[PDB]
Write an enzyme that holds these catalytic residues in place. Structure first.
Site, PDB file in Angstrom:
ATOM      1  N   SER B  43     -19.545 -55.857 -51.624  1.00 17.53           N
ATOM      2  CA  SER B  43     -19.403 -57.285 -51.940  1.00 17.53           C
ATOM      3  C   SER B  43     -20.777 -57.899 -52.161  1.00 17.53           C
ATOM      4  CB  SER B  43     -18.639 -58.007 -50.821  1.00 17.53           C
ATOM      5  OG  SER B  43     -18.495 -59.388 -51.101  1.00 17.53           O
ATOM      6  N   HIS B 156      -5.344 -60.646 -59.636  1.00 12.37           N
ATOM      7  CA  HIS B 156      -4.863 -59.277 -59.830  1.00 12.37           C
ATOM      8  C   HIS B 156      -3.684 -59.163 -60.818  1.00 12.37           C
ATOM      9  CE1 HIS B 156      -7.938 -58.313 -57.028  1.00 12.37           C
ATOM     10  NE2 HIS B 156      -7.505 -57.051 -56.930  1.00 12.37           N
ATOM     11  N   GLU B 165      -1.510 -61.719 -52.875  1.00 14.56           N
ATOM     12  CA  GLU B 165      -0.417 -60.794 -52.568  1.00 14.56           C
ATOM     13  C   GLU B 165       0.570 -61.379 -51.554  1.00 14.56           C
ATOM     14  OE1 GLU B 165      -1.719 -57.230 -50.172  1.00 14.56           O
ATOM     15  OE2 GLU B 165      -3.719 -57.836 -50.804  1.00 14.56           O
ATOM     16  N   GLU B 206      -2.770 -51.110 -55.215  1.00 15.92           N
ATOM     17  CA  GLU B 206      -2.171 -51.139 -53.869  1.00 15.92           C
ATOM     18  C   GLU B 206      -0.762 -50.525 -53.803  1.00 15.92           C
ATOM     19  OE1 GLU B 206      -4.401 -52.119 -51.839  1.00 15.92           O
ATOM     20  OE2 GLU B 206      -5.743 -53.250 -53.148  1.00 15.92           O
ATOM     21  N   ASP B 244      -1.361 -63.422 -48.451  1.00 14.06           N
ATOM     22  CA  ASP B 244      -2.822 -63.398 -48.564  1.00 14.06           C
ATOM     23  C   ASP B 244      -3.267 -64.410 -49.619  1.00 14.06           C
ATOM     24  OD1 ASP B 244      -5.535 -62.882 -49.064  1.00 14.06           O
ATOM     25  OD2 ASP B 244      -5.328 -60.714 -48.994  1.00 14.06           O
ATOM     26  N   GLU B 293      -3.250 -65.327 -44.340  1.00 12.74           N
ATOM     27  CA  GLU B 293      -4.606 -64.798 -44.334  1.00 12.74           C
ATOM     28  C   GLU B 293      -5.515 -65.595 -45.255  1.00 12.74           C
ATOM     29  OE1 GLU B 293      -4.816 -60.538 -44.516  1.00 12.74           O
ATOM     30  OE2 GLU B 293      -6.775 -60.567 -45.466  1.00 12.74           O
ATOM     31  N   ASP B 320     -10.700 -63.113 -42.850  1.00 14.37           N
ATOM     32  CA  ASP B 320     -11.175 -61.871 -43.485  1.00 14.37           C
ATOM     33  C   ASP B 320     -12.629 -62.003 -43.961  1.00 14.37           C
ATOM     34  OD1 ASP B 320     -11.362 -59.354 -44.792  1.00 14.37           O
ATOM     35  OD2 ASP B 320     -10.062 -59.902 -46.426  1.00 14.37           O
ATOM     36  N   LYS B 345     -12.539 -53.929 -41.159  1.00 11.90           N
ATOM     37  CA  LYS B 345     -12.801 -52.976 -42.256  1.00 11.90           C
ATOM     38  C   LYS B 345     -13.965 -52.067 -41.877  1.00 11.90           C
ATOM     39  CE  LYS B 345     -11.015 -55.931 -45.965  1.00 11.90           C
ATOM     40  NZ  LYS B 345     -11.226 -57.210 -46.689  1.00 11.90           N
ATOM     41  N   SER B 372      -7.451 -52.068 -41.297  1.00  9.60           N
ATOM     42  CA  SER B 372      -7.089 -52.199 -42.721  1.00  9.60           C
ATOM     43  C   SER B 372      -7.683 -51.168 -43.697  1.00  9.60           C
ATOM     44  CB  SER B 372      -7.448 -53.608 -43.187  1.00  9.60           C
ATOM     45  OG  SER B 372      -8.846 -53.751 -43.272  1.00  9.60           O
ATOM     46  N   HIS B 373      -7.017 -51.004 -44.853  1.00 10.90           N
ATOM     47  CA  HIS B 373      -7.422 -50.190 -46.014  1.00 10.90           C
ATOM     48  C   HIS B 373      -8.497 -50.867 -46.888  1.00 10.90           C
ATOM     49  CE1 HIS B 373      -5.246 -52.624 -49.109  1.00 10.90           C
ATOM     50  NE2 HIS B 373      -4.219 -52.686 -48.254  1.00 10.90           N
ATOM     51  N   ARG B 374      -9.128 -50.135 -47.815  1.00 12.23           N
ATOM     52  CA  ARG B 374      -9.844 -50.699 -48.995  1.00 12.23           C
ATOM     53  C   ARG B 374      -9.032 -50.466 -50.290  1.00 12.23           C
ATOM     54  NH1 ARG B 374     -15.064 -52.534 -47.739  1.00 12.23           N
ATOM     55  NH2 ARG B 374     -14.395 -54.000 -49.258  1.00 12.23           N
ATOM     56  N   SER B 375      -9.546 -50.782 -51.481  1.00  9.37           N
ATOM     57  CA  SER B 375      -8.850 -50.456 -52.745  1.00  9.37           C
ATOM     58  C   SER B 375      -9.030 -48.990 -53.139  1.00  9.37           C
ATOM     59  CB  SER B 375      -9.287 -51.377 -53.888  1.00  9.37           C
ATOM     60  OG  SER B 375      -8.968 -52.716 -53.583  1.00  9.37           O
ATOM     61  N   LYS B 396      -2.583 -52.995 -41.581  1.00 12.38           N
ATOM     62  CA  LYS B 396      -2.318 -53.245 -43.004  1.00 12.38           C
ATOM     63  C   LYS B 396      -2.708 -52.018 -43.818  1.00 12.38           C
ATOM     64  CE  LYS B 396      -4.575 -56.185 -45.781  1.00 12.38           C
ATOM     65  NZ  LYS B 396      -5.103 -57.428 -46.406  1.00 12.38           N
TER      66      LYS B 396
END
Lengths: 436, 436, 436, 436
Positions: B43, B156, B165, B206, B244, B293, B320, B345, B372-375, B396
């Site tokens: 980021s 997205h 989302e 996702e 989100d 979120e 977040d 994360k 949580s996940h990333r992309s 998540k």
């Protein structure tokens, strides 16, 4: 099959104060082993787990424990042999179901706890890891701040003082090794001051003195004199005081009043619950106090609500005999805003599995949880490893005098040598339940 | 000397979405083995931990990872060889000191996380125990509630919907194996409803749909028709919805306003921070929403205070990009009373040690923490061990379509089978930060 | 007795697309172990082995696999315990005899295959050798050339294109590590060209795009535009195109004609078998094509003879749904001159023993054999080891996008690192079935 | 080379009474482990072996042990590394030569005793045998008669009583487990008699009471009322009394007289050495006395000849500060016929080798030898092994209150259980120096 429990065995031994207690031993098939033995204490008709005692008026005045040795050898060892030594939660759940009572009346909490600690020590020996690492995983590092008893009163001496004991906490120290030295040097400055005044310097059941002080104001002002004579500060840069009551003992259950004329003379005050909150606020506004324990009755929930509104921003309000290590009451204490800390005793609840569930349920509410001794301690040291394994940050392990107490301090000096530069001492930053 | 680390070695490999990432392998003198590989992200404009990428415009459009694998092979390896594989915290603190920069930018956070995961998996294999038991100690047992994404919007998609989302949670389910089934049986009913309407049913990064809906009300009412069609019921007795709202994408700091004309049409409303909390309150009263979120901008601290005071007993307010998995910002969030949860994360912070410190601080404050996940994901499943090692109670991990996502739901089905009768699924009881 | 199979166990898990499949696991007496899990797909009344499915309309719409978990645990595991883990051919012959049906109807091909892969992985772990070395002996070294899907049509999208998918092959590359980069950069050059035109860039079940193209001529010419925009050549020094049909889908079984007006509009042509051979020759004379698959009907043997006479000198003509991995039809295909290659799917035949027999019977006739995926893939990677173990030279493992596909490409990058200077990439010299 | 010593390491820790002591740990190449830690004491004005203490007035009032742990880590460790762990006598003789001074004053006797105990406990663990069997060989079997202190006087109290402590012995008991029970059941009856009279029941350093009695006759008649009240009988058929007369505290060498006015009132008698033996003879005729310790001054050699001539067939005459655990003085005591027993203190002499030599010389002369505690004790229990390894038949270990004392009585309960039907408790038959 190297990790299977091969056999379990139990015998009768003595505690500090010289009364009977159990010891239990466990072996694996590779020949790794663990010993566990239980500190003494019990209650009946209360919401607490039961000890089993022989009742033979001809042996030890009825305090024998052969009736509990037969259960470990004839019943529990028959069921537990052939499990893997690492299945701690399945073993604890199997004993609780084998007993089949809510108070643990049939097998007794002394049989069930002694097995539960022996299995954990055999498993840590088999894997070749320290017991705080077996209990807590890789993320264990915070050395607890000790609260150290020094003067007793109430039902535990003949002196005209109502509160049951007084403590010091070395909240300003840089490391646990300097924090222990500061407490030792203050104990060896207080002993001289009582000797100079011609008072009694023989010790009670926790290693603190019990001298005939003329009142609570001289009991506390003499401790502030010992702190200065040792060379240290009072307050958040140095040492702070705490109290421990037993407000159950002078609460009149018919007149609904705190009658102090039981332990103090006929000239003492008599106080209703809002006036007891005013008296504790007058003390906290006058002295370097940081903790209070059981200041209100076991059943007076209205007092606990009012007290926590008044003082719970500034001071740690421990509940002990209020919650009795029980999650059925810690739930209601969190719901109704009744305290800001809990005291944990492993032999009140009676297994390691049920112990570690209550410690985390407290933490998620923001309550600090503290581990502690019983009167009849033994040469066992496990509560020092439970304190580092849960990162709990506080411990109540008694005064600087007897080996039943000094054995826990000497263990925390071994752990802080093993951890090296990973070890942390939080001092005053350990009170996360205040002003956060 | 059987436990010693004898070599560590790194290579370049593709992630899902087909960009370069990194993989590391560790061996001991006994010949025990562990592999770890890093999820992809960075980021720009704030001090997360920093990835290192190659300069050449030609190979893979300049996203190559050769400088990162050169650092593991030529710098980190000669320093970590000769340590015991169980010295996790001394190894983690050695890499941080070797790098010596606050955002980890000289060696790169992609090298340091790869080594830190490899060592933990070599050590749990050497002891012959599951990774959740190695990381968490004897007291690991709660299977997490899943948050299942099922629709996209915002940046997205090319649909006119403002939020990024939408999700479902199976809060009313008896067991994790029934909770996972209900999630799949709704997803296969939604897919049929989109085909009947003639909308597209291809999937994004996702594993969720992104159809050209008319507006946010038609999105949410389409989800409620799928929950009704699969046979269940909405609310705490069955399934609940969540959002989100990536609200930093449509805030304007030159007018100080939340401007919907970035993603909605030119008729769209423009809301100051008071009108924005009034909007989220209007949604929460109309539909079964449980979690929101990121609903206010990254720096709208007055907005976060006001929002949390309005909604904080009803709903989970997850932060977040507000906290960026940083204890320097989570401290202020606690002190100010700004939000009621955090999202974790692992590659924003860059080691397993610092990850477990941030979870513990949140838990003591009475917040939940969500892993949580990333992309850009990989075939690795380590976050399904971290969600059980900490008894965290929520995760998540994405929609029910692709094996970058399904590999985590399949690993929680192995863990729930090893634990047997000892496992717990909390469901609606997992929100300990609510209903006070 | 260190190498004996000690026990076998099975459970239900999810595949990509989110439907139930098996996982099966095997241990030896020394504690070596292997896991095998099955990719999904089946047919009935065809000449192919049968899956067993529960048929419960109340669980997963009848797609559950508990009926196949009972067979592994109650019957197959009871027969297989006590064999040596290395007796692969005797174990496979025992299961086929235990079932006692030609279609494998009683035990199901999913139960029998899952066991067969688990035993091979346990045996390679016990000997401590890579699985390609266990399967293939000392003479394994040729890295396969990949054929990569990028655009889809026919029954798999709403676009007016008749052929089911289009592919690229990087036949000019020096090594597999450069051959994978050339495919990645062309996928990230095509994605921009679809955004520029305003077409859909969401992915289907193999990771390729499915955009609304105006016809087959623009579908192929846009791929030739992406190849140039990435900077590479078209033809035998660079990249080449391939097609995959399903000529079964539009062959009229009563009028005996290929009616293109099913997927293309009412303005499309209708062609008899000699005119279809003329149409495929016009495409091959126009574009850089190297392979075609299922271009004629499954039963039109006269068409397959004529097509192979016309084009079989210049192009690889794959039979897939024509032979169904069956040696009873590959025999007749070799006798009557019906094709010049075969496509291999391990779950159509249902054991490793019957798979490796068909690969060698093809090779001895001069036919190239290619290993391939199903739609519902898993995080398993075994087909990459079968491709290097038989030195087969070609693989069909899907597009550069999802982890169910990228897990096989990342495995071939591990093998080419292990083999060092022994590894070979053949490029265009891998087509030994043409002009030899 | 599995038996070799590979390192030795030392640290500082607290004793009971809360002063600094020292702890040592030893490891072999096999990984066998032993720990030993030293009891605390020194005496000024005669040549015992000498402790080393730090100089700084600030830390612990100048009682610190940093110079002693520096000597173990920096001087003894490099010399003892490389020896076989079973070379006990060559290791002991090497430290004595390395020090090279008669009173052990250059390295300190606290360093040399810690290493000597650690090495013996590593060797018994490496052979996997009990410490009493390692020290004593196959013929160890006699459980010692305990001497239980129950009242203090003299310098250790502010009561007007001349002698330093009073004791009981359970000489009539069948078995050591009954002998320990009778000791505890008298102690719990004396404690009730003191509460009825209103005297204090707190405890001193040895775990016994120190009440303000009127004189020595009221002390001894109070003990006889406890023995009658618990249910037993006095003399050789049940329980017997004994004294520690620390007679060197109230001898005057400028007048040559035993002057009771140091601790008794100004009405007290003054006795020359002939009047002092007439006084002890007058007590022994009136009450069931079995043992008298230290009844004449350290240098009153004519007094010791005359005393031992008058009483020596009736009573045990133990010498303590007369011999100081030294063979140079015990030789003269034997030759000149001065006393009829010796009391052994392991840290007066400073190794396990020299301790076993002194017990052997006493035993051949027809004397008993009594093994004993110090005041500053630790959680260690080694003297309960030395009393069984030498079949010595007597021990002095303190009162039944504190775990610095109880830990030895609990270790003799383990040893009596391992021996089974092979163990012996002699009782009144243990006085082989009497009844000739």
């Amino acid at each position: 099959h190297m990790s299977i429990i091969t056999d379990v065995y139990a015998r009768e031994v003595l505690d500090s104060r010289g009364n009977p207690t159990l010891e239990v031993e466990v072996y694996t098939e590779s020949g790794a082993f663990g010993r566990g033995m239980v500190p003494s204490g019990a209650s009946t008709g209360e919401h607490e787990a039961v000890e089993l005692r022989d009742g033979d008026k001809s042996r030890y005045l009825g305090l024998g424990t052969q009736k509990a040795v037969d259960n470990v050898n004839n019943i529990i060892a028959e069921a537990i042999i052939g499990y893997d030594v690492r299945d701690q939660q399945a073993i604890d759940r199997a004993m609780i179901a084998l007993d089949g009572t809510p108070n643990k009346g049939k097998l007794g909490a002394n049989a069930i706890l002694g097995v539960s600690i022996a299995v954990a020590r055999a498993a840590a020996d088999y894997l070749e890891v320290p017991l705080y690492t077996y209990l807590g995983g890789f993320n264990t590092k915070v050395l607890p701040t000790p609260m150290m008893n020094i003067i007793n009163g109430g039902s535990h001496s003949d002196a005209p003082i109502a509160f049951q004991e007084f403590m010091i906490m070395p909240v300003g120290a840089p490391t646990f090794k300097e924090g222990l030295r500061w407490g030792a040097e203050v104990f060896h400055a207080l002993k001289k001051i009582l000797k100079e005044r011609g008072l009694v310097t023989a010790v009670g059941d926790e290693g603190g003195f019990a001298p005939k002080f003329e009142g609570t104001e001289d009991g506390v002002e003499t401790i502030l004199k010992a702190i200065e004579a040792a060379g240290y500060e009072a307050g958040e840069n140095g040492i702070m005081i705490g109290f421990d009551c037993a407000s159950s003992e002078f609460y009149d259950a018919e007149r609904a009043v705190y009658d102090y004329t039981k332990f103090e003379g006929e000239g003492a005050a008599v106080r209703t619950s809002a006036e007891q909150v005013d008296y504790l606020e007058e003390l906290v506004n006058k002295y370097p106090i940081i903790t209070i324990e059981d200041g209100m009755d076991e059943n007076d929930w209205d007092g606990w609500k009012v007290l926590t509104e008044r003082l719970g921003k500034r001071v740690q309000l421990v509940g002990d005999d209020f919650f009795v290590t029980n999650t059925e009451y810690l739930a209601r204490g969190i719901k109704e805003n009744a305290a800001n800390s809990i005291l944990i005793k492993v032999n009140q609840i009676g297994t390691l599995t049920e112990t570690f569930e209550a410690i985390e349920m407290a933490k998620e509410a923001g309550y600090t949880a503290v581990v502690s001794h019983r009167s009849g301690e033994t040469e066992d040291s496990t509560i020092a490893d439970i304190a580092v394994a849960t990162n709990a940050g506080q411990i109540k392990t008694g005064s600087l005098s007897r080996t039943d107490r000094i054995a826990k301090y000497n263990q925390l000096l071994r752990i802080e040598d093993q951890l090296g530069e990973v070890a942390q001492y939080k001092g005053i930053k350990s009170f996360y339940n205040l002003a956060a």
